[PDB]
Design a protein around this nucleic acid. Sequence first.
RNA 1: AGAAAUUU
RNA 2: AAUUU
Length: 534
Amino acid sequence: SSMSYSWTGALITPCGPEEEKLPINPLSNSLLRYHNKVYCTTSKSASQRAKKVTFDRTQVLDAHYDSVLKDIKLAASKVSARLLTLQQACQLTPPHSARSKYGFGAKEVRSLSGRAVNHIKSVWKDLLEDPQTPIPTTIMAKNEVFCVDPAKGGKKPARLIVYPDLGVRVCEKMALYDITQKLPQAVMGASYGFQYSPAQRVEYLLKAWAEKKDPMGFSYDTRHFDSTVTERDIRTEESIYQACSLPEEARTAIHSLTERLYVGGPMFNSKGQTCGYRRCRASGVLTTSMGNTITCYVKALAACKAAGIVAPTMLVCGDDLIVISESQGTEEDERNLRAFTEAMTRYSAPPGDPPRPEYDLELITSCSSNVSVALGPRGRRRYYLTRDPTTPLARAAWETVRHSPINSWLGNIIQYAPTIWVRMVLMTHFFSILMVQDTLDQNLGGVNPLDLPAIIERLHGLDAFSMHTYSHHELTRVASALRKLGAPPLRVWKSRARAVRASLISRGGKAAVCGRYLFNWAVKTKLKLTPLPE
RNA sequence: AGAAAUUU
RNA sequence: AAUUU
Ligand SMILES: Nc1ccn([C@@H]2O[C@H](COP(=O)(O)OP(=O)(O)O)[C@@H](O)[C@H]2O)c(=O)n1
Ligand SMILES: [Cl-]
Ligand SMILES: [Mn+2]
Ligand SMILES: [Mn+2]
Ligand SMILES: [Mn+2]
């Protein structure tokens, strides 16, 4: 029936200028050599993304769907939820949120400027009065950085972002924010993945795995998920929101937002022209993340039920899920995953890469990450979270006039501190750079480099400083990513580490603690590391 | 230059 | 600020 998009043919314009690297990258030309491989998805590529997401959806549901949907509404009934004062909603607006077409931006919104508040009052009135005139949206290409992959296309075309004006964004929050805080958790219980920390994720997966007599695992992801969301899906999303205790005033706002915005509408490029019309998810609305997650969850649990998946333990984050089940033998397991996929396709969530049964936790990737294992100080197995380092390294080398990648190095150092690639490569590079600059005592994205050992202890355990004997998978993949980006191989990073280390120790203070803890892997004379007050 | 979550 | 979807 429904096409996901129609296009006028008007271009998808830039929302400002898109910078390119320079002939010298002084911060990353000692990190890696192959800068030609590091690119940023551009709005020029958006046309290509559009061709790939424009297609015809033919959803076909069934008792398993209907049944899972029922039970989900019985959960929604436990939720009571409130409107949010116009002012509270204003102040959940992020600092840089794109300005309104109507002469005010996020400074005003956030500080409750009167011009902004009246406009928002009027917009909210109009949602209550008019429950049908479609609401215009702006469409734009997301600028992300990646490493080229000649196997998988060369250069990814840019993601499409579609969003209403700022006034509308605030009103969304008024109507729905509280729901976004109660509904998913209530509907999905422990399957709601965003509720967990990475440590909890890892523990959860191991618990699910240990619980089975004979575990089987797999993951799933929908191709161009936002395109695959049907008008009917979005209304079923509404109907699930409504199944809560709500003020009547919310119900009207919800229903109006659904009908005028969420279910579809016209699209304008940044230069103002009509660009096309939309009959699927607009990734840009408040309900993007909750919608996606709940909707993926319905289809997936129905699909599980269709396929025969036994004793499923699920974990869902948007369109990404992991199911750990009781295996029924591999011959049956393959058959059931094929069925799972057929069912998901019928429901309109067709697979990017068709899934496969797995019987080892390391081989299950989801949200671009997987669990892995190394040995700890005493020799116990220590399970942790990791990923292909290709992208983070690529982003580590993204230097332009406007952008510095140092903050990425730090963010990755913290999130993935226990990984061999963070420990040997990123840390080494990061510290090495700040020492030469003489900016160790500086603050980056409100974090003090010299705090890192503490920060890493609070978040990952003291084990993150002594881990050893990384897996074959992990070693292979790291080696292979460095070669792919023209980086030194790990042995060189060993050298650079020793040098940085001694150079850090000789400075004393917290710097020396950094040198001693973050780099104890780099020495044969390995010191006994004690917990840290801070 | 969209939203949310986690981390800080 | 970082990452993810
Ligand atoms: N930057 C992003 C990335 C994903 N998403 C949402 O999450 C969905 C699934 O993410 P994905 O990483 O599998 O990308 P798709 O190719 O499935 O669109 C997208 O279609 C978007 O609706 C988003 O809203 N903003
Ligand atoms: Cl141990
Ligand atoms: Mn997807
Ligand atoms: Mn309604
Ligand atoms: Mn995904």
